[PDB]
């Protein structure tokens, strides 16, 4: 439930969290980079 003060204009309620998104830059080779990309709670697959 979200209750606020009256708004004059159609203003956005910018709702966030403290959600984690961590990336490891993997590299087994000199020349190419593996991008281990994952938003942790919001499944990328």
């Amino acid at each position: 439930t979200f209750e606020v003060d009256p708004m004059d204009e159609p203003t956005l309620l910018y709702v966030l969290f403290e959600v984690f998104d961590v990336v490891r830059v993997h590299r087994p080779h000199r020349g190419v980079i593996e991008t281990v990309y994952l938003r942790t709670p919001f499944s990328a697959g």
Binding site: T1, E3, D5, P6
Partner: protein, 53 residues
């Protein structure tokens, strides 16, 4: 032409948990115990601080 009577359908625009609280339910003209007019109405409800003295 141009504006029509509207039987507004609500099955699309869904239903959420509705708050049982004083400043959310209805935005109408209210009252206190003594009789001093409280305003839970849209633009005035809880922005102003009226305390008896």
């Amino acid at each position: 032409s141009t504006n029509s009577f509207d039987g507004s359908i609500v099955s699309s625009y869904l239903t959420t948990r509705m708050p049982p609280w004083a400043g959310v339910r209805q935005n109408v003209m209210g009252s206190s115990i003594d009789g001093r007019p409280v305003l839970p109405a849209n633009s005035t409800t809880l922005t102003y601080e009226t305390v008896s003295g």
